[PDB]
Amino acid sequence: MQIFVKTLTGKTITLEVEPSDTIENVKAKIQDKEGIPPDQQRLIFAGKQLEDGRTLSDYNIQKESTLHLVLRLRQG
Amino acid sequence: GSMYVKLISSDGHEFIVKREHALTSGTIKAMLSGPGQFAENETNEVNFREIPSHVLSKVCMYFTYKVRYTNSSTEIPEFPIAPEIALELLMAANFLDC
Amino acid sequence: MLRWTVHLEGGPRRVNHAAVAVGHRVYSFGGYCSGEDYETLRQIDVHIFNAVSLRWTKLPPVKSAIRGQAPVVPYMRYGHSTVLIDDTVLLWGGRNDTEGACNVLYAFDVNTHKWFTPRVSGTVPGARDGHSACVLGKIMYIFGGYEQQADCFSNDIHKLDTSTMTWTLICTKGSPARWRDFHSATMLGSHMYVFGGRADRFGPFHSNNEIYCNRIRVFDTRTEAWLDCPPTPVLPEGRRSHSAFGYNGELYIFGGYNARLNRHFHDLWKFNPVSFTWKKIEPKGKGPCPRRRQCCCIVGDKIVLFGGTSPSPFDLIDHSDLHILDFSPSLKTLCKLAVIQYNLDQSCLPHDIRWELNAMTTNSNISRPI
Amino acid sequence: MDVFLMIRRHKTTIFTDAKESSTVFELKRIVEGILKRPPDEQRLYKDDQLLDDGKTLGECGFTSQTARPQAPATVGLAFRADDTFEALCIEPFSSPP
C-alpha cells in the first residue's frame, strides 16, 4: 500500500509502507526519502499524535491516507 | 532666549531661524550657550565663515524637517539631497553636529 | 524619519540565537546554522557587534578555571533566551539536537566574560525552547515555549527574583494567553505585552490544528493578572519568530513567519499601548528580505537586526547579514548615504568622516558567503 | 494645515511656518518682530503677485502640500523706502560645483 506524509508548509512525501509497520518504521522511511532524523519528526493522524510503538493498523490508517508531519523548529 | 537666531553664511546671506530649530545642531547649541552669551552680551547670531549660502539654506531646511517630523510615524517625503551638494552638505553636517 | 541605514555581511550566520545590547555593543549567544554540528557537545558561542565601529568579533573558547574541572559555559544551543540585568546576562532554556533537557540558569558577566551557574531555588520551569524572556527591575519573566519533558506548549509565567535567585510559578488572574511558542514578550512600564507565536487552536498539544496568534495579550506584573483588552481596528497578520522591541514607550514587531500562509515577513508594526492601537510603519530604504527568528537589539535610537532564516533565492538559508534601522537619522547620516549612493569621490572628505563611511561599507570576517 | 516658508528680501531669509488659515497680515507681524518694520511698511509677494493683508495663506495659493519643511515656499518681501516701496529683489544663493 501507499500513504502520504505532508508538512503544513506543503512538501508531500509518498511512502510505500506495510500495514504492520510501526510509527518508528515510518519515521525511518521518512528519513530515507528526505534525510530528516526520526527524533525531529512528529506524526499526527485525525488529530492524534502517533506513538513510536504502535503500528499503522493500530491507528486505523488505511490506503491513500495522509499523515500530518511536524518538525522541530531549529530555525524558528 | 530670543525666539529667533541669525545664521550668516560665508557669502553674507543671513538666515533667520527659530532658536529651537537651530538647536538641532549641537555646534550651534554650544555657540548659543558660549561664554558670556548672557544679558545684553547675548548676540543671538552665528557667523559661518566657511559654509556658503547654498549649503546653509539646505541645513536650515533640515532643521525644519527634523523638528516637524520627529516622532512622526506616517509616510513623509524623504529629505532631498542632490549629488552636486552631497559632499559639501556632508562636511557641513559633520561640522555642525546635526 | 525612520530609515534602514546600514546593511553589512560577514557576521555570524545564525538563526534562533539570542542577543542583548550592552551600551553600543551587541552580544549574540549561540543559535542554529544549517550544516553545523548541534549533536556533539560543544561550547556555546559569543559574538560581539560594535555598533560604533560596525565590526563583529568573536570571544575565544572558555578555558578550565581549575585543573581537572570542565569549563563553566552553556553547551551550544538554539531557542534559548537572554536578558540583561546590570552587568549580567541571564541565559536560560533552549536545546540542541542531542543532549536532552537543560533548565540550568546561566549567568554571564558582560565585563569579565566569566560564566557561572547561580544556585536557584523554588519552582524551576521545565526545559523548553521558543519561550520569551523579559525583565522588570531584578525580576526575570519566562512565558510560554514548548516544554521538552511534558511535550506540550506552555502558557505559564515563571518569574525569577534574581535578588534571591528564587523561581515562582505565578498563579495568575484573568484569562491567560494561549499556550504558544516563538512568540514575543515585551515590557512597557510594568506591563508585559505578548504578541504572536505558534499555537494550537484547541489546547496545549500538537493536533494538526496549528494557528498563528495576532491578538495581543497583556500581563500586569503589579497585580499579576492578564488584562481584558479592547479590540483594535487593525492588527498584524499572525506570525511566529518575529522580533519585538519597545522603543520610546511603544511596541514594535518585525518580520517572522506564518506557516498557514507559508509567508515570511519583513513588515514593521507599531503598537501604542496608551491608545491601544496598531499601525503598520514603512521605513525608508530597502531593509532586510523577509525572514524569521532574526534578533533585534536597541542601541540608542537605532535597532540592530541580524541573522535569521528565509526562503532560498527545504530550500531555506540562514543569514550572516546585519541591518540597522535608524529611527532618527541625522543630516550627517543622510549625507553619508547620499555620498555612497551617488558614488562620489570621498578623498577630499576629512578623515573622521571617511572612517565612518568605511565603517558602514566594510563586511566583517566571521563568515564568507555560502 | 501648516505651511513652511522662506520670507526673502535682498540677502535676508526668514524660515518660518504658519497655518494655511493664517493671514498675510499675521505673516507681516512675524516679520515685524524680527526685522522691526511695521506691516504698513511691508509688501509680501508670491512670485510677482502682491499679497493682501486680509487673505489667508491658502487663499494666496500656499498649501501644506506645496510648502513642506524640506522644500519651503518662498514669499518675497519689500520694505517702504521713503515715499515709495523698494523694488522686490531677492539675491540668489551661491552655487555648487
Author numbering:
A (entry chain D): 1 to 76
B (entry chain C): 15 to 112
C (entry chain A): 1 to 313, 321 to 377
D (entry chain B): 1 to 97
Paste lines from the article.
Mutation of ubiquitin’s Gly75 to the consensus degron residues Arg or Gln resulted in ~3- and ~2-fold tighter binding, respectively. For example, adjacent to the C-terminal Gly-binding site in KLHDC3, an aliphatic/acidic pocket determines preference for a Gly/C-degron’s penultimate Gln or Arg.
These SRs all feature Kelch-type 6-bladed β-propellers that recognize C-degrons bearing terminal Gly residues. Members of the KLHDCX family employ Kelch-type 6-bladed β-propellers to bind substrates, and a BC-box binding EloB/C that serve as bridges to a cullin (CUL2 or CUL5). Importantly, we discovered that these E3s share a defining C-terminal carboxylate-anchoring element (R/F-S-R) establishing them as C-degron E3s.
